[PDB]
């Protein structure tokens, strides 16, 4: 949110989450800070960050905080968080962690996994039938749009 306490507490919370879950050293999560661009719309915040997380999953691209002129030196201790200032096109993002912190101790987290790992649990015939249906629906939606 570009507030002192919020950004410090968020970087700390993510770092301790990964440190406790045994994230391998040298594997930080890239932090996306959409509010630099879209502002902070209170309740629509998590929705915008979730849409961005879905788009990051789909494209494999991690946007960068283009207003990140100088990441605070107090954020160097968080070795499990990287803070990009420019978009990095990766070979694929498997999951994204959308975390929101709201007034009244409204901490909230969501995890968004790529739909490939859903499609992996289907048999061949089910997936092909679904793909045909989605192609037809996509053409119909394109016409409607």
């Amino acid at each position: 949110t570009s507030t002192v306490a919020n950004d410090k507490n968020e970087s700390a919370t993510i770092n301790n989450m990964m440190k406790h879950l045994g994230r391998s050293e040298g594997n930080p999560v890239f932090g996306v800070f959409q509010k630099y661009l879209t502002g902070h719309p209170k309740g629509a915040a998590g929705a915008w960050m979730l849409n961005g997380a879905i788009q990051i999953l789909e494209s494999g691209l991690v946007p960068g905080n283009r207003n990140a002129d100088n990441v605070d030196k107090l954020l160097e201790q968080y070795e499990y968080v990287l803070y990009p200032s420019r978009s990095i096109q990766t070979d694929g993002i498997k999951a994204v962690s959308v975390t929101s912190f709201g007034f009244g101790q409204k901490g909230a987290q969501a995890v968004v996994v790529h739909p490939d790992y859903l499609f992996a649990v289907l048999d061949r015939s089910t997936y092909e039938e679904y793909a045909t249906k989605v192609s037809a629906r996509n053409k119909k939606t394109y016409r409607y749009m």
């Binding site: 406790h20 502002g39 209170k42 309740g43 905080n65 101790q105 909230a108 969501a110 996994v113 679904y130």
Partner: protein, 241 residues
């Protein structure tokens, strides 16, 4: 804000490929399409009407309080698009409303009460909310930022050394979540899988706007004795079970 919600809702259904909202009812009962979206404050413009314009005796619609309620946006969505009888649960997280809404929607779907849920969050910018946030010193001071030589497009700078408050915004964001089997049976584009979602409070305090580490409990596990891996984390063991 209700206009923003209606636009975001139709655009979310169109992203889901549902040109006609009644196409859900070919596959799920009308009682299985819900709307668990919410707002931090709701119809702040309607609240301004009620609390200021009516005090001033200005011409204000007689059902302004209706538009002021936070569940009114969901009500208008159902009244104009869905016409479902599924669960409606309007969260208020004040800033985490959308993630809390995803949490409510997922538990709604997994409990079997709904097969499709419209989750998300919305909020509007107004003079009064802006002034209050300024009084709480939560938002950045534009005079100070101009003195520092910061343009509006660079005032919102998370993680920097010079972050001095947030940049208030407006709008809405909606998602259409459903069971994977329903998505595949309908042939809708499955953009993502919501693997996990959680909400949390922090601790004792006397500062509501103070954030805390309460959501750290999403990473909680026991580590007293890890001499051997847990078989349940191993995929093939669960597969043979």
């Amino acid at each position: 804000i209700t206009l923003y919600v209606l636009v975001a809702t139709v655009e979310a259904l169109l992203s889901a490929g549902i040109t006609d909202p009644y196409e859900f009812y070919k596959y799920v009962h009308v009682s299985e399409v819900g709307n668990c979206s919410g707002s931090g404050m709701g119809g702040v413009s309607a609240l301004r009407g009620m609390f200021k314009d009516r005090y001033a005796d200005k011409p204000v619609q007689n059902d302004i309080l209706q538009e002021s309620f936070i569940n009114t946006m969901s009500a208008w969505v159902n009244m104009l698009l869905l016409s479902s009888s599924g669960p409606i649960k309007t969260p208020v997280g004040a800033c985490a409303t959308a993630v809390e809404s995803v949490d409510i929607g997922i538990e709604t779907i997994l409990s079997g009460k709904a097969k499709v849920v419209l989750v998300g969050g919305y909020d509007d910018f107004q003079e009064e909310g802006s002034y209050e946030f300024a009084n709480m010193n939560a938002t950045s001071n534009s005079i100070e930022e101009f003195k520092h030589g910061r343009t509006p497009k660079e005032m919102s700078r998370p993680t920097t050394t010079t972050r001095n408050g947030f940049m208030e915004a407006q709008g809405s964001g909606i998602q259409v979540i459903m069971t994977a089997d329903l998505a595949l049976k309908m042939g809708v584009p499955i953009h993502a899988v919501l693997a996990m979602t959680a909400t949390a409070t922090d601790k004792i305090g006397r500062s509501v706007p103070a954030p805390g580490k309460g959501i750290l409990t999403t990473a909680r596990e026991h580590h007293g004795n890890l001499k051997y891996p847990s078989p349940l984390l191993n995929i093939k063991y669960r597969k043979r079970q």
